[PDB]
Design an enzyme around this catalytic site. Structure first.
Site, mmCIF file in Angstrom:
data_model
loop_
_atom_site.group_PDB
_atom_site.id
_atom_site.type_symbol
_atom_site.label_atom_id
_atom_site.label_comp_id
_atom_site.label_asym_id
_atom_site.label_seq_id
_atom_site.Cartn_x
_atom_site.Cartn_y
_atom_site.Cartn_z
ATOM 1 N N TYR A 1 18.412 35.434 36.823
ATOM 2 C CA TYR A 1 19.154 36.708 37.060
ATOM 3 C C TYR A 1 20.095 36.931 35.889
ATOM 4 C CZ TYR A 1 17.691 37.045 42.043
ATOM 5 O OH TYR A 1 16.992 37.192 43.201
ATOM 6 N N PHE B 1 15.072 33.293 41.950
ATOM 7 C CA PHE B 1 15.349 34.404 42.898
ATOM 8 C C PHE B 1 16.471 34.064 43.895
ATOM 9 C CE2 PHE B 1 11.001 35.004 41.342
ATOM 10 C CZ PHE B 1 11.112 36.254 40.790
ATOM 11 N N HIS C 1 5.734 41.909 39.612
ATOM 12 C CA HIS C 1 7.044 41.284 39.874
ATOM 13 C C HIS C 1 7.836 42.137 40.866
ATOM 14 C CE1 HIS C 1 11.147 40.030 38.917
ATOM 15 N NE2 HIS C 1 10.662 38.950 38.266
ATOM 16 N N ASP D 1 12.438 34.896 34.338
ATOM 17 C CA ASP D 1 13.672 34.280 33.789
ATOM 18 C C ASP D 1 14.809 34.478 34.780
ATOM 19 O OD1 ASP D 1 14.052 37.053 33.107
ATOM 20 O OD2 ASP D 1 15.094 36.502 31.273
HETATM 21 O O1 LIG Z 1 14.356 39.979 38.343
HETATM 22 C C1 LIG Z 1 13.831 39.038 37.660
HETATM 23 O O2 LIG Z 1 13.143 39.222 36.612
HETATM 24 C C2 LIG Z 1 14.103 37.608 38.094
HETATM 25 C C3 LIG Z 1 15.314 37.300 38.600
HETATM 26 N N1 LIG Z 1 15.623 36.045 38.982
HETATM 27 C C4 LIG Z 1 14.759 34.979 38.875
HETATM 28 O O3 LIG Z 1 15.091 33.854 39.220
HETATM 29 N N2 LIG Z 1 13.532 35.295 38.363
HETATM 30 C C5 LIG Z 1 13.141 36.556 37.931
HETATM 31 O O4 LIG Z 1 12.014 36.684 37.473
#
Ligand SMILES: O=C(O)c1c[nH]c(=O)[nH]c1=O
Length: 229
Positions: free
Chosen positions: A72, A83, A193, A70
């Site tokens: 930030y 990300f 992750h 999901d």
């Molecule tokens: O740190 C995270 O969980 C995330 C942070 N940002 C994203 O775009 N996707 C992720 O999964």
């Protein structure tokens, strides 16, 4: 302007609009969900006009997809590409710092100048999250609210193209897309992750960038140019 008000043919790139036709009503429903959140005095990220940004690069040009969980949770970070952060953001989110540490270890490239992953999106990398909105400071707050059918439809549509595809699936929510990549034109890379909570359990040392390029070359597809300025 919102996905409540306007059709896929206006919100996303032509190829994506046809690909996401099965979830047209579901996308409008997500528009209604975000409206109801604002009505109730709760906030969401990224900004409404960035929520579907990953589908504004050509569907037909996708060779690799990177799937997170999901967006930030910190205001000023999420930009609707998984990300990625805007070129003026510093410090980097710790997840992105961890991605850049593996990027250097795998590829031998210097640290990127900034956190903007636009180059990857421009070179056939889909930067997807399993869930496309979040409430600020509350990771996974919009899990199970209707986005999963949209990101399932995106993966399913990519996989049915008469084209090779490599999927990099970062974390447990991303890896629920694995069953939709069973077909012989598709191959998935799975790892924990890059978040500090999980990264030491298999993200670091996973070499996703070099392994995706080996997998593409082996399927007759052109490798991704991963090099960021
Ligand atoms: O740190 C995270 O969980 C995330 C942070 N940002 C994203 O775009 N996707 C992720 O999964």
């Amino acid at each position: 302007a919102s996905m409540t008000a306007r059709p896929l043919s206006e919100l996303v790139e032509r190829g994506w609009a046809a690909a996401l036709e099965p979830v047209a009503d579901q996308v409008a429903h997500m528009g209604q969900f975000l409206r109801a959140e604002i009505a109730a005095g709760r906030r969401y990220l990224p900004a409404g006009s960035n929520v579907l940004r990953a589908f504004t690069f050509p569907f037909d040009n996708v060779r690799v997809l990177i799937v997170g969980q999901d967006p930030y949770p910190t205001p000023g970070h999420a930009v609707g590409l998984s990300f990625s952060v805007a070129p003026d953001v510093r410090p980097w989110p710790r997840s992105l710092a961890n991605i850049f540490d593996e990027y250097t270890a795998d590829l031998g490239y210097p640290l990127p100048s900034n956190g903007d992953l636009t180059p990857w999106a421009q070179r056939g990398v889909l930067l997807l999250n399993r869930v496309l909105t979040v409430r600020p400071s509350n990771p996974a707050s919009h899990r199970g609210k209707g986005w999963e059918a949209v990101t399932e439809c995106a993966i399913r549509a990519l996989a049915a193209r008469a084209a090779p595809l490599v999927a990099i699936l970062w974390g447990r929510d991303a890896s629920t897309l694995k069953p939709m990549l069973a077909a012989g034109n598709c191959v998935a890379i799975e790892s924990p992750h890059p978040s500090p909570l999980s990264a030491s359990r298999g993200f670091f040392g996973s070499r996703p960038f070099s392994r995706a390029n080996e997998l593409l070359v082996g399927m007759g597809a052109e490798p991704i140019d991963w090099r960021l300025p």
